[PDB]
Write a protein that binds this DNA or RNA. Structure first.
Lengths: 201, 68, 89, 82
RNA sequence: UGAGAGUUUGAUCCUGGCUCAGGACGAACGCUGGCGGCGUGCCUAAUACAUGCAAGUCGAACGCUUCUUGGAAAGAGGAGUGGCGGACGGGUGAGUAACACGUGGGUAACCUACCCAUCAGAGGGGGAUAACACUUGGAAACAGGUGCUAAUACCGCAUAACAGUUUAUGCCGCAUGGCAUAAGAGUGAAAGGCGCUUUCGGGUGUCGCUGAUGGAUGGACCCGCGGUGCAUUAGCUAGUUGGUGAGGUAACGGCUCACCAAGGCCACGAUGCAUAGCCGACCUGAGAGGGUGAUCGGCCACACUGGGACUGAGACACGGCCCAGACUCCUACGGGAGGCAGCAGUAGGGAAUCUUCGGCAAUGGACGAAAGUCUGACCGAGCAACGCCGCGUGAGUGAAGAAGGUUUUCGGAUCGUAAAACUCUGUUGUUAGAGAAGAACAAGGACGUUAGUAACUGAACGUCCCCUGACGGUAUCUAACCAGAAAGCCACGGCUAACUACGUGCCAGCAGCCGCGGUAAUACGUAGGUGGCAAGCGUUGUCCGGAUUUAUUGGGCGUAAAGCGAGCGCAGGCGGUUUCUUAAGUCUGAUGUGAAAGCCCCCGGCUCAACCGGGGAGGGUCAUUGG
């Protein structure tokens, strides 16, 4: 499964945008349902760690088993911290590479582009979105049929291109220069609440 | 029971169809109503039948999904 | 009846083989004496690795190859060396 | 029996048993015939010692006693007469 | 790499139990389900078993017989004598508390078919028998009698002692003794087949045959140490413990005998009773630990229940023999036949566990000189969300919030950018084209080299032609078409994330622990909404954690549970100061070993991942030798 629901209730429940600052929390910044505008008392310190974890899980649209295995894998580095290495491994998945490069507006669109077989790493096609893109691998746009309507238009309007992403808008090749850093990556949510959430799992 | 030791067992839900000499299935679970009862029968698993109003936790009580 | 034979180590339809010296009564994947090289039927020019200093020692003690082991031991030039050590002295 | 080859082994081994027992009894009586004449103190005492030795030796080439049993036997008899 | 919470009271602190929040599984069952990849699937009655298959092969060891092409040579069948195989491979865990297993050693007490090497032989004779032909008794299974015949079948005679044993010599070892050399005494084997040269040539290639010695491989025996409950189980032994001799075995030995003696084992747990195959490993834990021994590998034990031997290099024998017993079956009543804990399958037991499938193409195994024949091992296919992993059931833009549902103080709020509408996409689906790797070979032809030869045939490997796929038209790749076929289960009073209506009225019902329900129930039952997970989601059972709640790590005994009513003392546990010595504990170095697969570290291949491969570390309370 992935998810198909209204995708905007989700942001109103975390209190974070999740869609490139394009405002879902413009009107009614409160939660969904009857008891939306009428908030109530405090939230535990279990609700806080759960809310941080859900923020990160819904950012990149993955499921709970895969999230937890990625977290367990990031723990075997021991070079740096354990939340930084996590949120950095999270960025190296082929879906974020298409999002950051700029071939798609959303992450759902980028996911459908990499699922339906329209992109290639090093020339060879790769079809599965949880792929692990390493540093220095020019991912391309299937030079067979790169004349599609939405890819073309979403290359023009560059809302955000980062300081670790390289790209050329003629051959349509991009790559990571090097690994990013927390200052360059959502210094807003957390990586410590999420680490504590998995201590008693 | 098949091993020939005797026990009493609670039958849950609203309304059943159990009569003398009908064959049933037991699971663990102790009721806190009176002594001497330590088991539950499971609804909709043999001669016993699922309850016929439920709409909310039909996986217990053994109710099938209704088109309503 | 010591032998030099192949031993299957793939998954289901991607086989791999270890070259092994075993007593002939043993099961194909059961007990053996020691391992002597490797062999890969895929990988279009098939891959052989082997020590070839234990093959020449077992051969001179009466071990005997199977039919495929003899083919891949002559493609490596091990049977010629046995020839030049035994019937030459 | 069920298998065809198991039916042949039955008669083959029956025949082997027959002749094996015949020849073992031959050897045993040769030895005993020497012993009963060394226990009497009789003339013609080295010839039947020779014959008993030969009997044991021939039984060992017919696959009836192992080979160490034959060494043991010849030793025992040697210590009795010669 | 060591997280806690609720619950004794009118309120408190301490003690204390009970319960919950994490994992995992050969799982079962309730509701519900789209696919691929890799794995897994009688835990119960070691219950009883219809039907098919699971072990044969050799005509280049030997005589016969039937055909297809009266004397003809080949091809294809049939039984028989003889060799080798049937002790492997495959199944199960009933017995077993012991050298059964693990780890470390010993055998100067040992055996070993096929395979590799070395030395020496391979001479000359004899008497039979199955088959076949005729014949008797048989319900049958099957038994007898007469006559002829072959061999690599069988038996004696020769020749061989390098084997064993005894004597002298030399060297040596941990008692018994070991090695090498010399003699002396009695003794023991053997078989041919197919080719080449064939002047009688009498020579020779190859595969077999006999004796002796090594290697390899497989087995046998003995020893140190280690892993379970009960003392509401303290005595156990009479071939028992030792000696002398005799027999016996591959082999040492009370292994078994006759005699002689009175010994052996036990509080450091003998004996008995109950339970159990053992290990690599697997789950959990911060660790020390605790709980399991299913898939895969190693060792053991058993084969309808209980005794025995025979053949053989090897069995006291898994689809062998003989006897007894229970059970089942056929019979002319005199008698006969059988053993799924091999693969499928059936009835029964159970909460519960699969097809009476294809093929020897690949790897291994038996026989054969080889083509080959056999192989339910094995390689593939079928069934099942049983598990792990991967990808879907669309994507983008879209408002004053369309209709409807729920609520409302009747203004509105929420389901909700969610639908609509516009533009896109084709992983999947469908239809149509193309389309694999897994295969290396044996055999058969030509050609070369080396060691043997009088010489050639052949031997042993090199180079080249030629020859084979069950899965299967499978994976995969290309073209067109369509958002169309593909979301459910649990919870929402506190623990613990997520609230309002209506119905009912200590009823109907709910609960893991606190506890809810008697007119305005966020705790029962529905609806709207919300939370957690998702092709799954909950429930019951079992184990480790939380539990310092058996505390070595790591607790206590004035009043909470807990100092024997007091002394005297055998065994045990622990002991003042100091000089020299020893090296049992302790510390340390080097060498051997602790299989493979697993966990872990680095690297690499399947579009990724599960999964697969290569190189390492780790794991001993271990042994030997030096400080």
């Amino acid at each position: 499964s992935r998810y198909t629901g209204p995708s905007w209730k989700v942001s109103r429940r975390l209190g974070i945008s999740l869609s490139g600052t394009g405002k879902e929390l413009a009107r009614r910044p409160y939660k969904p349902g009857q008891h939306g505008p009428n908030s109530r008392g405090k939230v535990s310190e279990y609700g806080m760690q759960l809310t941080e974890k859900q923020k990160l899980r819904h950012m990149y649209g993955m499921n709970e088993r895969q999230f937890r295995t990625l977290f367990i894998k990031a723990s075997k580095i021991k070079e740096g911290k354990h939340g930084v290495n996590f949120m950095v491994l999270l960025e190296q998945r082929l879906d974020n590479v298409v999002y950051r490069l700029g071939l798609a507006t959303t992450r759902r669109q980028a996911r459908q582009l990499v699922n339906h077989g329209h992109i290639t790493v090093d020339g060879k096609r790769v079809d599965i979105p949880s792929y692990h893109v390493e540093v220095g691998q020019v991912i391309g746009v299937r030079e067979k049929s790169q004349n599609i309507s939405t890819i073309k238009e979403a290359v023009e309007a560059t809302v955000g291109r980062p300081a670790f992403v390289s790209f050329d808008t003629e051959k349509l090749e991009g790559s990571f220069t090097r690994l990013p850093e927390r200052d360059e990556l959502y210094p807003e949510i957390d990586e410590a609440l999420v680490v504590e959430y998995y201590n008693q799992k | 029971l098949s091993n020939l030791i005797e026990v009493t067992a609670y039958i849950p839900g609203i309304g059943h169809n159990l009569q003398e000499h009908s064959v049933v299935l037991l699971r663990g679970g102790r009721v806190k109503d009176l002594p001497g009862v330590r088991y539950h029968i499971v609804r909709g698993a043999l001669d016993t039948a699922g309850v016929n109003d439920r709409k909310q936790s039909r996986s217990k009580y053994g109710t099938k999904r209704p088109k309503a | 009846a010591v032998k030099i034979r192949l031993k299957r180590m793939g998954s289901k339809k991607s086989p791999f083989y270890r070259i092994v010296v075993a007593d002939s009564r043993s099961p194909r994947d059961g007990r053996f004496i020691e391992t002597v090289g490797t062999y890969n039927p895929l990988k279009d020019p098939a891959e052989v690795v082997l020590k070839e200093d234990l093959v020449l020692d077992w051969l001179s003690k009466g071990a005997q190859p199977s039919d495929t082991v003899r083919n891949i031991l002559s493609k490596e030039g091990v049977m010629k060396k046995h020839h030049e050590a035994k019937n030459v002295k | 029996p069920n298998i065809e080859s198991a039916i042949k082994r039955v008669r083959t081994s029956a025949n082997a048993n027959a002749k094996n027992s015949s020849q073992t009894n031959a050897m045993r009586t040769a030895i005993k015939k020497f012993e009963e004449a060394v226990a009497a103190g009789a003339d013609n005492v080295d010839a039947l010692y020779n014959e008993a030795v030969k009997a044991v030796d021939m039984a060992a080439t017919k696959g009836l006693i192992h080979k160490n049993k034959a060494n043991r036997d010849k030793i025992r008899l040697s210590k009795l007469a010669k």
